[PDB]
């Protein structure tokens, strides 16, 4: 996640193309969000 942060945020700005590609791949693979944000469990970030 830190590597992706350095990939998508450079020079105090948010790079549009990399941001869009990263969020696209993230929502293609929901398991990357962790157990809290999984659809079926619905654990909730605050509860986690």
């Amino acid at each position: 996640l830190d590597f992706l942060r350095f990939a998508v945020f450079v020079n105090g700005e948010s790079v549009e193309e990399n941001a869009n590609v990263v969020v696209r791949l993230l929502i293609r693979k929901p398991e990357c969000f962790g157990p809290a944000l999984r659809g079926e469990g619905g654990s909730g970030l605050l509860a986690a």
């Binding site: 996640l1 992706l4 700005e13 948010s14 869009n20 969020v23 909730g44 970030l45 605050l46």
Partner: protein, 49 residues
């Protein structure tokens, strides 16, 4: 780290004001991804001293 990555993947304020479809779409995707109540709860989360 995940929430930070999403926050820095959020579109720029210039894009939001310009109203580009892809910018508003990614912003809405993040808005659905992360809820307001959990965020305000973790902001208000008590910390030991």
């Amino acid at each position: 780290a995940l929430i930070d990555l999403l926050g820095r993947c959020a579109p720029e304020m210039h894009l939001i004001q310009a109203g580009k479809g892809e910018a508003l779409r990614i912003r809405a995707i993040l808005r659905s991804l992360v809820p307001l109540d959990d965020l305000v709860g973790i902001i208000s989360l008590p910390l030991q001293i």
